[PDB]
Structures are given as C-alpha cells and as structure tokens.
Design a protein around this ligand. Structure first.
Ligand SMILES: *[C@@H]1O[C@H](CO)[C@@H](O[C@@H]2O[C@H](CO)[C@@H](O)[C@H](O)[C@H]2NC(C)=O)[C@H](O)[C@H]1NC(C)=O
Ligand SMILES: *[C@H]1O[C@H](CO)[C@@H](O[C@@H]2O[C@H](CO)[C@@H](O)[C@H](O)[C@H]2NC(C)=O)[C@H](O)[C@H]1NC(C)=O
Lengths: 162, 54
C-alpha cells in the first residue's frame, strides 16, 4: 500500500483483535493481549460510511429510459432513440464502475494511512525510551506495567518519568 | 387491387382526435364512413407506461 504499513513493515493483520480495525498488542510480566484503538477506528468508520452514502447519493439523479415506438418508415428516428438511450446507459455504467474502482483504491490506502499514523503516534511518544524493532513493535528499556501500557494507548505516556 | 389479408382486399384506415371540453366535432360524408359509436373520457391523467412483455 501507499503508506507502507499494511502488508509492509507490519507483515500481517491480527485475527485476535476483534473489536476494532486498528490497535495495540502489549506484552509484559503481567501478561499480554490485544486492545483496539477505538478513536482511530471510529474515525475510519465515519469516513467509510460517509463515502458509501456519498457514492449511493451521487448516482441518485441518473438517466431513466422510457418506451417509445416507431412505425416501419420511421427507422432513422427509431435508431436515434436507441443510440441515445444506449449511450446514456454506457456513460452511467462507466461512471459507476470507475467510481467504485477509484474509491476502492482510496479506501484501502486510507486504512493503510490510519495504521501508519497510529504507529507514528506511538513512536513520537516513546522516542528513545524504547527500541524500534522494525516490525510494528517497540521494546521498552524500562518495565512497562499495565498502567504504563495504558498511558501509551492514552496519549499520556510520561516521557520524562522514564 | 390489394393482397388478401384475413381474406380481405379492402382496407380500413383509422383516425383519432382529442376533443377538448366545450368543443364540437363535425362529420360530413358521401360513403365509406366508419362512424363513432363509443368514445373514451379521459378521467385520470398521471404516470403510466406501455410495457412490452410476453
Ligand atoms: C356545446 O358547444 C358549444 C359551442 O359549439 C358550447 O358553448 C357553451 O355554450 C353556451 C352558449 O349557449 C355558453 O353560455 C357557455 O359558456 C359554453 N359553456 C362552457 C362551459 O364553456 C357549449 O357550451 C357546449 N354545450 C354545453 C356546455 O352544454
Ligand atoms: C488513560 O490511562 C491512564 C493510565 O491508566 C490514566 O491515568 C490514570 O487514571 C486513573 C483513573 O482515572 C487514576 O486513578 C490514576 O492515578 C492514573 N494513573 C496514571 C499512571 O496515569 C488516564 O487518566 C487515562 N486517560 C484517558 C482515558 O483519557
């Protein structure tokens, strides 16, 4: 992906994080587990929801064909009518298919971005109080108990304290 | 001289018009007239369509 996180330096996703799209896995002396970053997650849900509704709604006004009939000596205008109706169907078919392709690409990249930013958010808190392992993980120099871990997820990680 | 469709060499050509309220229609003829007996009032106008289907 464009942002290098998903299927990049973070090799794979987590079956074990069920509760959100992005989040944290912690590991210390007390144990280990997954925790979803709900805010980043809810941001993503609002964006994707709006997108879908934007797509659905933009295609709201669109060409509606009507039945028109013509006799045996009106072949020219019958052909015109047919070319006209087919022409608009092809145009709207193109618009729909291309919009889906373009916005699918942007949706996948959007998720990649949200992950990259969540990773950097944590990196920028910890700074040189942890080893950046290069795989999505940060190994602490100090012991980091569950409250310590929570403060990382908080945005509250007190850097001067360590 | 015309080919026989349904065993007829004669033909019927049919015509129509919309007679607006308070207007009168006038006929005059020497023969060959296919006169109206029944006509249709247009009571309800709205969205409809003729759909081609078997
Ligand atoms: C029949 O057609 C005549 C004209 O060919 C229509 O004119 C109406 O006639 C009277 C005259 O006697 C007028 O006072 C009315 O104002 C006309 N009526 C309307 C509603 O416009 C005649 O109206 C038709 N016959 C009717 C309505 O009974
Ligand atoms: C995020 O978590 C940190 C750590 O758990 C919170 O700070 C603690 O908050 C609890 C409950 O409010 C207090 O009793 C503790 O004294 C705090 N300890 C430490 C070490 O920070 C912080 O309040 C939380 N922030 C949120 C949820 O926004």
């Amino acid at each position: 992906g464009l942002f290098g996180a998903i299927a990049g330096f973070i090799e794979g996703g987590w079956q074990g994080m069920v509760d959100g799209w992005y989040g944290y896995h912690h590991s210390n002396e007390q144990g280990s587990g997954y925790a979803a970053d709900k805010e980043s997650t809810q941001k993503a849900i609002d964006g994707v929801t709006n997108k879908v509704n934007s797509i659905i709604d933009k295609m709201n006004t669109q060409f509606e064909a009507v039945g028109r009939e013509f006799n045996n000596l009106e072949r020219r205008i019958e052909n015109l009518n047919k070319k006209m109706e087919d022409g608009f169907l092809d145009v709207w078919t193109y618009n729909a298919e291309l919009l889906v392709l373009m916005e699918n690409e942007r949706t996948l990249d959007f998720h990649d971005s949200n992950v990259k930013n969540l990773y950097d958010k944590v990196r920028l808190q910890l700074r040189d109080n942890a080893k950046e392992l290069g795989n999505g993980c940060f190994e602490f120099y100090h012991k980091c108990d569950n409250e310590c871990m929570e403060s990382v997820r908080n945005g509250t990680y007190d850097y001067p304290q360590y | 001289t015309r080919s026989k469709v349904n065993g007829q060499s004669g033909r019927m050509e049919f015509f129509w018009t919309i007679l607006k309220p308070n207007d009168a229609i006038n006929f005059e003829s020497n023969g060959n007239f296919i006169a109206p007996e029944y006509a249709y009032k247009i009571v309800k106008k709205g969205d409809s369509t003729i759909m081609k289907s078997e």
